[PDB]
Design a binder for this molecule. Structure first.
Ligand code: CL
Lengths: 63, 213, 221, 54
Protein backbone atom coordinates (compact mmCIF):
# COMPACT_ATOMS: atom_id res chain seq x y z
CA UNK A 1 0.00 0.00 0.00
CA UNK A 2 1.35 3.37 1.12
CA UNK A 3 3.30 2.79 4.31
CA UNK A 4 6.03 4.90 5.79
CA UNK A 5 8.98 3.04 7.25
CA UNK A 6 10.61 5.24 9.89
CA UNK A 7 14.31 4.80 10.49
CA UNK A 8 16.71 5.99 13.18
CA UNK A 9 20.23 6.35 11.82
CA UNK A 10 22.64 5.97 14.71
CA UNK A 11 26.25 6.75 13.89
CA UNK A 12 29.44 5.69 15.66
CA UNK A 13 30.06 9.14 17.16
CA UNK A 14 26.62 9.21 18.77
CA UNK A 15 25.05 11.40 16.10
CA UNK A 16 21.45 10.53 15.24
CA UNK A 17 19.49 11.22 12.07
CA UNK A 18 15.98 10.08 11.24
CA UNK A 19 14.62 9.14 7.84
CA UNK A 20 11.38 8.04 6.22
CA UNK A 21 10.94 5.59 3.32
CA UNK A 22 7.59 5.55 1.54
CA UNK A 23 5.96 3.02 -0.76
CA UNK A 24 4.53 -0.48 -0.42
CA UNK A 25 5.96 -2.29 2.61
CA UNK A 26 8.24 -4.40 0.44
CA UNK A 27 9.53 -1.49 -1.66
CA UNK A 28 10.12 0.72 1.38
CA UNK A 29 11.96 -2.14 3.12
CA UNK A 30 14.23 -2.80 0.17
CA UNK A 31 14.92 0.96 -0.08
CA UNK A 32 15.81 1.25 3.63
CA UNK A 33 18.24 -1.68 3.44
CA UNK A 34 19.79 -0.30 0.24
CA UNK A 35 20.26 3.12 1.88
CA UNK A 36 21.84 1.48 4.95
CA UNK A 37 24.27 -0.43 2.71
CA UNK A 38 25.23 2.79 0.94
CA UNK A 39 25.84 4.72 4.17
CA UNK A 40 27.87 1.81 5.51
CA UNK A 41 30.52 2.43 2.83
CA UNK A 42 31.47 5.64 4.66
CA UNK A 43 30.15 5.05 8.17
CA UNK A 44 31.14 1.44 8.78
CA UNK A 45 29.21 -1.84 8.79
CA UNK A 46 25.54 -1.46 9.67
CA UNK A 47 23.21 -3.41 11.94
CA UNK A 48 19.44 -3.09 11.46
CA UNK A 49 17.09 -3.85 14.32
CA UNK A 50 13.44 -4.01 13.36
CA UNK A 51 10.52 -2.94 15.55
CA UNK A 52 6.75 -2.58 15.04
CA UNK A 53 6.44 -5.51 12.60
CA UNK A 54 9.19 -4.04 10.42
CA UNK A 55 7.62 -0.54 10.18
CA UNK A 56 10.33 0.95 12.34
CA UNK A 57 14.05 0.33 12.05
CA UNK A 58 17.05 1.24 14.16
CA UNK A 59 20.20 1.18 12.05
CA UNK A 60 23.62 1.54 13.72
CA UNK A 61 26.93 2.11 11.96
CA UNK A 62 30.16 0.61 13.38
CA UNK A 63 32.36 3.55 12.37
CA UNK B 1 11.09 6.23 -20.37
CA UNK B 2 13.65 6.32 -17.58
CA UNK B 3 12.54 6.76 -13.98
CA UNK B 4 14.58 8.25 -11.15
CA UNK B 5 13.97 6.73 -7.72
CA UNK B 6 15.10 9.00 -4.84
CA UNK B 7 15.74 7.96 -1.22
CA UNK B 8 14.91 8.55 1.49
CA UNK B 9 11.56 10.35 1.20
CA UNK B 10 12.65 12.56 4.06
CA UNK B 11 15.70 12.99 6.26
CA UNK B 12 16.13 15.01 9.46
CA UNK B 13 19.60 15.90 10.73
CA UNK B 14 21.45 18.31 13.03
CA UNK B 15 23.35 21.41 11.99
CA UNK B 16 26.90 20.27 11.19
CA UNK B 17 25.94 16.66 10.33
CA UNK B 18 26.95 15.01 7.05
CA UNK B 19 23.83 14.27 5.00
CA UNK B 20 23.43 11.84 2.10
CA UNK B 21 20.59 11.66 -0.42
CA UNK B 22 20.40 9.15 -3.26
CA UNK B 23 18.85 8.74 -6.67
CA UNK B 24 18.71 5.60 -8.78
CA UNK B 25 18.09 5.56 -12.56
CA UNK B 26 16.08 2.65 -13.99
CA UNK B 27 18.69 2.19 -16.71
CA UNK B 28 22.03 3.73 -17.72
CA UNK B 29 22.08 7.52 -17.91
CA UNK B 30 25.86 7.93 -17.97
CA UNK B 31 26.49 11.10 -15.91
CA UNK B 32 23.55 13.11 -17.27
CA UNK B 33 22.09 13.87 -13.82
CA UNK B 34 21.50 17.21 -12.11
CA UNK B 35 20.56 18.02 -8.51
CA UNK B 36 18.19 20.89 -7.58
CA UNK B 37 17.29 22.50 -4.26
CA UNK B 38 13.75 23.82 -3.84
CA UNK B 39 12.59 26.03 -0.99
CA UNK B 40 8.79 26.10 -0.54
CA UNK B 41 7.12 28.54 -2.92
CA UNK B 42 10.32 29.16 -4.88
CA UNK B 43 11.86 28.03 -8.16
CA UNK B 44 14.26 25.07 -7.88
CA UNK B 45 17.90 26.09 -7.76
CA UNK B 46 20.64 24.16 -9.56
CA UNK B 47 23.30 22.72 -7.24
CA UNK B 48 25.12 20.07 -9.25
CA UNK B 49 25.16 19.12 -12.94
CA UNK B 50 26.57 16.13 -14.87
CA UNK B 51 26.50 14.11 -11.63
CA UNK B 52 29.51 15.73 -9.90
CA UNK B 53 30.12 19.32 -11.05
CA UNK B 54 29.28 22.18 -8.71
CA UNK B 55 27.31 25.04 -10.27
CA UNK B 56 28.91 28.47 -9.92
CA UNK B 57 28.29 30.11 -6.55
CA UNK B 58 27.01 26.94 -4.86
CA UNK B 59 28.69 26.39 -1.45
CA UNK B 60 31.42 23.75 -1.49
CA UNK B 61 29.62 21.72 1.20
CA UNK B 62 27.45 20.31 -1.61
CA UNK B 63 28.89 17.48 -3.71
CA UNK B 64 27.61 14.76 -6.03
CA UNK B 65 28.97 11.41 -7.17
CA UNK B 66 27.96 8.48 -9.34
CA UNK B 67 28.37 4.73 -9.22
CA UNK B 68 26.75 2.99 -12.18
CA UNK B 69 23.07 3.97 -11.99
CA UNK B 70 23.28 5.19 -8.38
CA UNK B 71 23.69 8.93 -7.75
CA UNK B 72 24.47 10.61 -4.44
CA UNK B 73 24.12 14.19 -3.22
CA UNK B 74 26.11 14.84 -0.04
CA UNK B 75 25.91 17.87 2.22
CA UNK B 76 29.12 17.72 4.26
CA UNK B 77 28.09 20.13 7.01
CA UNK B 78 24.38 20.76 7.26
CA UNK B 79 23.42 24.42 7.71
CA UNK B 80 20.04 25.62 9.02
CA UNK B 81 19.31 27.33 5.68
CA UNK B 82 19.71 23.96 3.92
CA UNK B 83 16.17 22.82 4.67
CA UNK B 84 14.53 22.21 1.29
CA UNK B 85 13.22 19.52 -0.99
CA UNK B 86 16.05 18.18 -3.19
CA UNK B 87 15.32 16.71 -6.67
CA UNK B 88 17.51 14.81 -9.09
CA UNK B 89 16.83 14.95 -12.87
CA UNK B 90 18.18 12.86 -15.76
CA UNK B 91 18.55 14.30 -19.24
CA UNK B 92 20.06 11.22 -20.88
CA UNK B 93 16.83 10.49 -22.78
CA UNK B 94 13.65 12.39 -23.53
CA UNK B 95 11.50 12.86 -21.56
CA UNK B 96 13.91 14.23 -18.98
CA UNK B 97 12.50 12.94 -15.71
CA UNK B 98 12.72 14.08 -12.11
CA UNK B 99 13.04 12.02 -8.94
CA UNK B 100 10.14 12.30 -6.47
CA UNK B 101 12.18 14.53 -4.16
CA UNK B 102 13.73 14.18 -0.72
CA UNK B 103 12.64 16.58 1.99
CA UNK B 104 15.50 17.58 4.32
CA UNK B 105 14.63 19.02 7.71
CA UNK B 106 16.94 20.40 10.40
CA UNK B 107 17.02 18.71 13.82
CA UNK B 108 17.56 20.93 16.88
CA UNK B 109 16.90 21.15 20.62
CA UNK B 110 13.38 21.18 22.03
CA UNK B 111 11.67 24.59 22.40
CA UNK B 112 8.18 25.04 23.90
CA UNK B 113 5.80 27.33 21.98
CA UNK B 114 4.59 30.75 23.02
CA UNK B 115 0.79 30.34 23.00
CA UNK B 116 -1.65 33.16 22.19
CA UNK B 117 -5.34 33.46 21.40
CA UNK B 118 -7.35 35.97 19.34
CA UNK B 119 -11.13 36.49 19.62
CA UNK B 120 -13.10 37.24 16.44
CA UNK B 121 -12.70 40.90 15.43
CA UNK B 122 -15.70 43.20 15.72
CA UNK B 123 -15.55 43.72 11.94
CA UNK B 124 -15.96 39.97 11.27
CA UNK B 125 -18.78 39.69 13.79
CA UNK B 126 -20.69 42.32 11.79
CA UNK B 127 -20.94 39.49 9.27
CA UNK B 128 -22.33 36.07 10.12
CA UNK B 129 -19.13 34.24 11.06
CA UNK B 130 -16.66 34.13 13.96
CA UNK B 131 -13.06 32.94 13.63
CA UNK B 132 -11.07 32.19 16.78
CA UNK B 133 -7.33 31.95 16.23
CA UNK B 134 -4.84 30.12 18.44
CA UNK B 135 -1.15 30.77 17.75
CA UNK B 136 1.83 28.58 18.72
CA UNK B 137 4.97 30.59 18.07
CA UNK B 138 8.56 29.44 17.49
CA UNK B 139 8.63 25.86 18.73
CA UNK B 140 10.41 22.54 18.03
CA UNK B 141 9.70 19.77 17.23
CA UNK B 142 6.80 20.29 14.84
CA UNK B 143 4.54 17.78 16.64
CA UNK B 144 1.87 19.35 18.84
CA UNK B 145 -1.71 18.70 19.89
CA UNK B 146 -4.06 21.69 19.85
CA UNK B 147 -7.57 21.23 21.19
CA UNK B 148 -10.49 23.61 21.30
CA UNK B 149 -12.98 23.79 24.14
CA UNK B 150 -16.11 25.95 24.12
CA UNK B 151 -17.76 26.11 27.56
CA UNK B 152 -15.56 23.11 28.46
CA UNK B 153 -17.04 21.08 25.60
CA UNK B 154 -14.38 19.51 23.39
CA UNK B 155 -14.76 20.71 19.80
CA UNK B 156 -14.45 18.38 16.83
CA UNK B 157 -14.43 18.86 13.06
CA UNK B 158 -14.66 22.66 13.14
CA UNK B 159 -11.02 23.78 13.23
CA UNK B 160 -8.08 23.79 10.82
CA UNK B 161 -4.32 24.03 11.34
CA UNK B 162 -1.60 25.64 9.27
CA UNK B 163 2.14 25.37 9.92
CA UNK B 164 5.08 27.47 8.67
CA UNK B 165 8.32 26.14 7.15
CA UNK B 166 11.34 25.94 9.47
CA UNK B 167 12.94 29.27 10.33
CA UNK B 168 16.09 29.57 8.23
CA UNK B 169 18.08 30.81 11.17
CA UNK B 170 16.72 29.02 14.24
CA UNK B 171 14.89 26.03 12.68
CA UNK B 172 11.67 26.49 14.66
CA UNK B 173 8.07 26.22 13.49
CA UNK B 174 4.96 28.25 14.20
CA UNK B 175 1.40 26.95 13.95
CA UNK B 176 -2.07 28.45 13.81
CA UNK B 177 -5.28 26.66 14.70
CA UNK B 178 -8.42 28.42 13.60
CA UNK B 179 -11.83 27.69 15.11
CA UNK B 180 -14.73 28.72 12.85
CA UNK B 181 -18.30 29.23 14.07
CA UNK B 182 -21.44 31.02 12.96
CA UNK B 183 -21.96 34.36 14.73
CA UNK B 184 -25.11 32.94 16.30
CA UNK B 185 -23.33 29.94 17.87
CA UNK B 186 -20.43 32.12 18.94
CA UNK B 187 -22.85 34.44 20.69
CA UNK B 188 -24.47 31.59 22.51
CA UNK B 189 -21.35 30.72 24.46
CA UNK B 190 -18.88 32.49 26.67
CA UNK B 191 -15.56 30.72 27.32
CA UNK B 192 -13.27 30.01 24.38
CA UNK B 193 -10.17 27.98 25.16
CA UNK B 194 -7.25 26.58 23.18
CA UNK B 195 -5.37 23.73 24.90
CA UNK B 196 -1.82 22.98 23.74
CA UNK B 197 0.21 19.81 24.32
CA UNK B 198 3.93 19.86 23.37
CA UNK B 199 7.14 18.06 24.31
CA UNK B 200 8.74 21.25 25.59
CA UNK B 201 5.92 21.97 28.07
CA UNK B 202 5.88 20.18 31.45
CA UNK B 203 2.08 19.85 31.17
CA UNK B 204 -0.52 21.18 28.70
CA UNK B 205 -1.07 24.94 28.40
CA UNK B 206 -4.59 26.33 28.12
CA UNK B 207 -5.06 29.80 26.67
CA UNK B 208 -8.57 31.12 27.18
CA UNK B 209 -10.94 34.12 26.96
CA UNK B 210 -14.53 35.06 27.77
CA UNK B 211 -16.60 36.49 24.92
CA UNK B 212 -16.98 40.23 25.48
CA UNK B 213 -14.13 40.71 27.97
CA UNK C 1 21.99 39.05 -15.38
CA UNK C 2 20.20 36.07 -16.90
CA UNK C 3 16.49 36.29 -16.12
CA UNK C 4 13.29 34.49 -17.06
CA UNK C 5 9.83 35.82 -16.23
CA UNK C 6 6.61 33.80 -16.64
CA UNK C 7 3.19 35.41 -17.00
CA UNK C 8 -0.35 34.50 -18.04
CA UNK C 9 -1.31 32.08 -15.26
CA UNK C 10 -4.73 32.33 -13.65
CA UNK C 11 -8.12 30.71 -13.08
CA UNK C 12 -9.60 28.82 -16.05
CA UNK C 13 -12.61 26.49 -16.31
CA UNK C 14 -12.14 22.78 -17.09
CA UNK C 15 -12.09 22.41 -20.89
CA UNK C 16 -10.81 25.99 -21.15
CA UNK C 17 -7.73 27.56 -22.73
CA UNK C 18 -4.86 29.68 -21.40
CA UNK C 19 -1.58 30.98 -22.87
CA UNK C 20 1.58 31.40 -20.81
CA UNK C 21 4.54 33.60 -21.75
CA UNK C 22 8.17 33.37 -20.62
CA UNK C 23 10.13 36.56 -21.30
CA UNK C 24 13.89 36.12 -21.27
CA UNK C 25 16.65 38.68 -20.81
CA UNK C 26 20.41 38.76 -20.35
CA UNK C 27 20.78 36.01 -22.94
CA UNK C 28 19.36 34.94 -26.33
CA UNK C 29 16.97 31.96 -26.33
CA UNK C 30 18.33 31.19 -29.80
CA UNK C 31 21.40 29.88 -27.99
CA UNK C 32 19.66 27.49 -25.59
CA UNK C 33 16.84 25.03 -25.09
CA UNK C 34 13.81 26.44 -23.29
CA UNK C 35 11.71 24.09 -21.09
CA UNK C 36 8.42 24.26 -19.24
CA UNK C 37 8.21 22.34 -15.96
CA UNK C 38 5.21 22.25 -13.65
CA UNK C 39 4.51 21.46 -10.03
CA UNK C 40 1.05 20.61 -8.71
CA UNK C 41 0.33 21.87 -5.17
CA UNK C 42 2.22 19.73 -2.64
CA UNK C 43 3.64 17.47 -5.36
CA UNK C 44 6.91 17.03 -7.25
CA UNK C 45 8.37 18.63 -10.37
CA UNK C 46 6.98 17.33 -13.68
CA UNK C 47 8.53 18.05 -17.09
CA UNK C 48 6.02 19.43 -19.61
CA UNK C 49 7.71 20.47 -22.89
CA UNK C 50 10.82 21.89 -24.54
CA UNK C 51 11.85 23.82 -27.64
CA UNK C 52 15.16 24.66 -29.34
CA UNK C 53 14.23 28.09 -30.73
CA UNK C 54 17.08 28.09 -33.29
CA UNK C 55 15.47 25.30 -35.33
CA UNK C 56 12.01 25.01 -33.79
CA UNK C 57 12.40 21.38 -32.66
CA UNK C 58 9.90 20.56 -29.90
CA UNK C 59 9.16 17.66 -27.51
CA UNK C 60 6.24 17.08 -25.10
CA UNK C 61 5.25 15.02 -22.08
CA UNK C 62 2.79 12.29 -23.09
CA UNK C 63 0.18 13.71 -20.71
CA UNK C 64 -0.03 17.08 -22.48
CA UNK C 65 0.50 16.05 -26.14
CA UNK C 66 -2.12 17.55 -28.44
CA UNK C 67 -3.57 19.72 -25.65
CA UNK C 68 -0.51 21.99 -25.13
CA UNK C 69 1.90 23.53 -27.65
CA UNK C 70 5.23 25.25 -27.05
CA UNK C 71 6.63 27.97 -29.32
CA UNK C 72 9.18 30.76 -29.33
CA UNK C 73 9.55 34.22 -30.84
CA UNK C 74 13.27 34.95 -31.06
CA UNK C 75 12.72 38.60 -32.03
CA UNK C 76 10.85 39.11 -28.75
CA UNK C 77 13.17 36.65 -26.95
CA UNK C 78 10.03 35.11 -25.50
CA UNK C 79 8.72 31.55 -25.25
CA UNK C 80 5.07 30.48 -24.98
CA UNK C 81 2.89 27.62 -23.81
CA UNK C 82 -0.61 27.42 -25.31
CA UNK C 83 -2.78 25.24 -23.08
CA UNK C 84 -6.12 23.89 -24.27
CA UNK C 85 -8.64 21.32 -23.06
CA UNK C 86 -7.43 22.03 -19.53
CA UNK C 87 -8.16 19.59 -16.72
CA UNK C 88 -8.05 19.67 -12.92
CA UNK C 89 -4.78 17.74 -12.95
CA UNK C 90 -3.15 20.54 -14.97
CA UNK C 91 -3.49 22.79 -11.90
CA UNK C 92 0.10 23.68 -11.00
CA UNK C 93 2.75 26.34 -10.81
CA UNK C 94 4.36 26.49 -14.29
CA UNK C 95 8.05 27.32 -14.53
CA UNK C 96 10.04 28.21 -17.63
CA UNK C 97 13.75 27.32 -17.65
CA UNK C 98 16.74 27.27 -19.99
CA UNK C 99 19.05 24.32 -20.64
CA UNK C 100 22.44 24.36 -22.34
CA UNK C 101 23.05 28.01 -21.51
CA UNK C 102 26.76 28.89 -21.48
CA UNK C 103 27.32 25.18 -22.13
CA UNK C 104 25.82 24.01 -18.81
CA UNK C 105 23.86 20.81 -19.32
CA UNK C 106 21.23 21.47 -16.68
CA UNK C 107 18.51 24.02 -15.93
CA UNK C 108 20.65 26.79 -14.47
CA UNK C 109 18.01 29.52 -14.56
CA UNK C 110 14.30 29.31 -13.80
CA UNK C 111 11.53 31.91 -13.70
CA UNK C 112 9.55 32.62 -10.53
CA UNK C 113 6.66 30.51 -11.82
CA UNK C 114 3.03 31.28 -12.69
CA UNK C 115 0.06 29.49 -11.05
CA UNK C 116 -2.61 27.91 -13.25
CA UNK C 117 -5.85 26.92 -11.52
CA UNK C 118 -8.33 24.72 -13.38
CA UNK C 119 -11.71 24.93 -11.64
CA UNK C 120 -15.41 25.65 -12.20
CA UNK C 121 -15.42 27.85 -9.10
CA UNK C 122 -15.64 31.65 -9.36
CA UNK C 123 -13.11 34.30 -8.35
CA UNK C 124 -13.62 35.82 -4.90
CA UNK C 125 -11.72 38.57 -3.12
CA UNK C 126 -10.83 38.05 0.55
CA UNK C 127 -12.19 39.74 3.63
CA UNK C 128 -9.38 41.08 5.81
CA UNK C 129 -9.86 41.18 9.59
CA UNK C 130 -7.49 42.37 12.32
CA UNK C 131 -5.92 40.04 14.86
CA UNK C 132 -5.58 42.72 17.49
CA UNK C 133 -2.79 42.49 20.05
CA UNK C 134 -4.12 42.12 23.60
CA UNK C 135 -3.15 40.85 27.05
CA UNK C 136 -3.94 37.43 25.55
CA UNK C 137 -1.32 37.82 22.80
CA UNK C 138 1.66 39.05 24.82
CA UNK C 139 4.47 37.52 26.87
CA UNK C 140 8.00 38.34 27.98
CA UNK C 141 7.65 41.94 26.77
CA UNK C 142 6.73 41.05 23.20
CA UNK C 143 3.26 41.03 21.63
CA UNK C 144 1.68 39.23 18.67
CA UNK C 145 -0.78 40.78 16.25
CA UNK C 146 -1.83 40.08 12.70
CA UNK C 147 -4.39 39.89 9.95
CA UNK C 148 -6.82 37.14 9.05
CA UNK C 149 -7.21 36.95 5.25
CA UNK C 150 -10.37 34.96 4.75
CA UNK C 151 -12.57 33.40 2.06
CA UNK C 152 -10.77 33.93 -1.26
CA UNK C 153 -10.36 32.07 -4.56
CA UNK C 154 -8.14 31.17 -6.23
CA UNK C 155 -4.63 31.29 -4.78
CA UNK C 156 -2.42 33.19 -4.29
CA UNK C 157 -2.56 36.00 -1.77
CA UNK C 158 0.47 38.04 -0.69
CA UNK C 159 0.84 39.81 2.66
CA UNK C 160 3.50 42.31 3.66
CA UNK C 161 3.79 44.49 6.77
CA UNK C 162 4.35 48.25 6.68
CA UNK C 163 4.89 48.09 2.90
CA UNK C 164 7.75 45.65 3.43
CA UNK C 165 9.56 47.75 6.03
CA UNK C 166 8.63 45.18 8.68
CA UNK C 167 10.05 41.72 7.98
CA UNK C 168 11.52 40.53 11.32
CA UNK C 169 9.21 38.31 13.38
CA UNK C 170 6.67 37.88 10.55
CA UNK C 171 4.91 34.54 9.99
CA UNK C 172 2.54 34.32 7.07
CA UNK C 173 0.89 30.91 7.23
CA UNK C 174 0.28 28.72 4.17
CA UNK C 175 -3.31 29.03 2.98
CA UNK C 176 -5.80 26.37 3.99
CA UNK C 177 -8.66 25.16 1.80
CA UNK C 178 -11.85 25.50 3.82
CA UNK C 179 -14.88 23.23 3.48
CA UNK C 180 -16.64 26.04 1.57
CA UNK C 181 -14.07 25.70 -1.21
CA UNK C 182 -12.53 29.04 -0.31
CA UNK C 183 -9.04 29.67 1.03
CA UNK C 184 -8.02 31.39 4.23
CA UNK C 185 -4.73 32.36 5.86
CA UNK C 186 -3.31 34.43 8.68
CA UNK C 187 -0.20 36.55 8.84
CA UNK C 188 1.16 37.44 12.28
CA UNK C 189 4.03 39.52 13.55
CA UNK C 190 5.72 39.73 16.94
CA UNK C 191 6.81 43.18 18.13
CA UNK C 192 7.91 44.92 21.34
CA UNK C 193 5.04 45.39 23.81
CA UNK C 194 6.16 48.99 24.34
CA UNK C 195 5.78 49.81 20.64
CA UNK C 196 2.03 49.22 20.74
CA UNK C 197 0.20 52.51 20.26
CA UNK C 198 3.29 54.37 19.06
CA UNK C 199 4.30 52.28 16.06
CA UNK C 200 1.74 51.90 13.29
CA UNK C 201 1.25 48.35 12.06
CA UNK C 202 -0.46 47.79 8.72
CA UNK C 203 -0.81 44.56 6.78
CA UNK C 204 -0.83 44.97 3.00
CA UNK C 205 -2.90 42.25 1.37
CA UNK C 206 -2.88 41.77 -2.40
CA UNK C 207 -5.17 39.33 -4.18
CA UNK C 208 -4.34 39.84 -7.85
CA UNK C 209 -6.93 37.40 -9.25
CA UNK C 210 -9.78 39.54 -7.84
CA UNK C 211 -7.83 42.78 -8.19
CA UNK C 212 -8.13 43.15 -4.41
CA UNK C 213 -5.62 45.33 -2.59
CA UNK C 214 -6.20 46.03 1.10
CA UNK C 215 -4.15 47.94 3.68
CA UNK C 216 -5.43 47.05 7.15
CA UNK C 217 -4.27 48.95 10.24
CA UNK C 218 -4.12 46.69 13.28
CA UNK C 219 -4.67 48.18 16.75
CA UNK C 220 -5.32 47.11 20.35
CA UNK C 221 -9.09 47.02 20.97
CA UNK D 1 2.58 33.78 -42.33
CA UNK D 2 1.72 31.33 -45.10
CA UNK D 3 0.58 27.70 -44.87
CA UNK D 4 0.60 24.50 -46.93
CA UNK D 5 -2.62 22.74 -47.98
CA UNK D 6 -2.37 20.34 -45.01
CA UNK D 7 -2.22 23.13 -42.43
CA UNK D 8 -5.09 24.93 -44.16
CA UNK D 9 -7.06 21.70 -43.82
CA UNK D 10 -6.43 21.44 -40.08
CA UNK D 11 -7.62 25.04 -39.52
CA UNK D 12 -10.74 24.26 -41.57
CA UNK D 13 -11.76 21.22 -39.47
CA UNK D 14 -11.41 23.11 -36.18
CA UNK D 15 -13.02 26.26 -37.59
CA UNK D 16 -16.14 24.22 -38.42
CA UNK D 17 -16.56 22.28 -35.12
CA UNK D 18 -20.10 22.98 -33.84
CA UNK D 19 -19.66 22.17 -30.12
CA UNK D 20 -16.52 24.20 -29.31
CA UNK D 21 -16.95 27.66 -27.79
CA UNK D 22 -14.98 30.56 -29.31
CA UNK D 23 -12.25 30.46 -26.64
CA UNK D 24 -11.61 26.78 -27.32
CA UNK D 25 -11.83 27.13 -31.10
CA UNK D 26 -9.28 29.96 -31.18
CA UNK D 27 -7.08 28.24 -28.59
CA UNK D 28 -6.74 25.17 -30.84
CA UNK D 29 -6.27 27.31 -33.94
CA UNK D 30 -3.45 29.08 -32.07
CA UNK D 31 -1.89 25.70 -31.24
CA UNK D 32 -1.90 24.74 -34.93
CA UNK D 33 0.02 27.93 -35.70
CA UNK D 34 2.33 27.41 -32.72
CA UNK D 35 3.65 23.99 -33.63
CA UNK D 36 2.85 22.53 -37.09
CA UNK D 37 4.61 19.27 -36.06
CA UNK D 38 1.73 18.67 -33.61
CA UNK D 39 -1.08 19.17 -36.12
CA UNK D 40 -2.41 15.61 -35.89
CA UNK D 41 -2.32 15.45 -32.06
CA UNK D 42 -3.94 18.88 -31.81
CA UNK D 43 -6.76 17.96 -34.19
CA UNK D 44 -7.33 14.74 -32.23
CA UNK D 45 -7.70 16.60 -28.93
CA UNK D 46 -9.97 19.23 -30.48
CA UNK D 47 -12.14 16.41 -31.87
CA UNK D 48 -12.36 14.73 -28.46
CA UNK D 49 -13.34 18.04 -26.86
CA UNK D 50 -15.88 18.71 -29.59
CA UNK D 51 -17.45 15.25 -29.18
CA UNK D 52 -17.64 15.52 -25.38
CA UNK D 53 -19.53 18.84 -25.58
CA UNK D 54 -22.14 17.52 -28.05
CL1 CL E 1 7.05 14.75 -28.49
Amino acid sequence: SEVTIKVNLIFADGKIQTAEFKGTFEEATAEAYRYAALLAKVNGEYTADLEDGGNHMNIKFAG
Amino acid sequence: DIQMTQSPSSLSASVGDRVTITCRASQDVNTAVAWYQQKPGKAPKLLIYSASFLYSGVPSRFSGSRSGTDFTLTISSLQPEDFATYYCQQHYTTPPTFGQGTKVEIKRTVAAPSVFIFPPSDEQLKSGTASVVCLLNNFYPREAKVQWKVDNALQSGNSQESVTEQDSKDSTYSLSSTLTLSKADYEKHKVYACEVTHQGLSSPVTKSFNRGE
Amino acid sequence: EVQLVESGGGLVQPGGSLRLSCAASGFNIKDTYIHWVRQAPGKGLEWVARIYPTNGYTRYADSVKGRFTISADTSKNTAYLQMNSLRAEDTAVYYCSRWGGDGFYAMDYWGQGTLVTVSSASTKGPSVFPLAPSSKSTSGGTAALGCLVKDYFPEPVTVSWNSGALTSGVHTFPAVLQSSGLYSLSSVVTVPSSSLGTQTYICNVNHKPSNTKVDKKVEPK
Amino acid sequence: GSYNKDQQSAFYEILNMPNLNEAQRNGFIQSLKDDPSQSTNVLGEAKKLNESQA
